[PDB]
Amino acid sequence: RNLSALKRHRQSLKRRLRNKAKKSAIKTLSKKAIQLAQEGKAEEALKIMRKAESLIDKAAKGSTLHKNAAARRKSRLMRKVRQLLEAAGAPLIGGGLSA
């Protein structure tokens, strides 16, 4: 009637549920950042962006994101942010983005 491979499903669910979060996290967070950065919040933007970044390479560790999955998202985050901070702002605090 049954085969103890559901042990694989039970897990299947757990894991999903886990990364499912750091997943949607980086999302909302990725936004909160570019938002300000564009809004003008020069430094306090770079702050969040620096956080977002972490949470990314952080998720890269497990099986959530991986390879360039992280690196890609980054090259776009600290890409658009910097391309909104030039909307007259001069990268204030020493956020991620390099001089």
Decide whether 18 or 40 has the Cβ nearer to RNA.
18
> Per CB under 7 A, does 90 bind RNA?
no
Q: Are the C-beta atoms of residues 28 and 48 closer than 8 Å to each other?
A: no
Other CB atoms within 10 Å distance of the CB of residue 24: 10
Rule CB under 7 A: choose which of 12, 24, 31, 42 binds RNA: 12
> Per CB under 7 A, does 53 bind RNA?
yes
Q: Closest separation between CB of residue 95 and RNA, Å?
A: 6
DSSP output for 16-81 = HHHHHHHHHHHHHHHHHHHHHHHHT-HHHHHHHHHHHHHHHHHHHHTTSS-HHHHHHHHHHHHHHT
Q: Closest separation between CB of residue 28 and RNA, Å?
A: 13
> Per CB under 7 A, does 24 bind RNA?
no
Binding residues (CB under 7 A) for RNA: these are 1-16, 18-20, 22, 50, 53-54, 56-58, 61-64, 66-72, 74-80, 82, 94-99
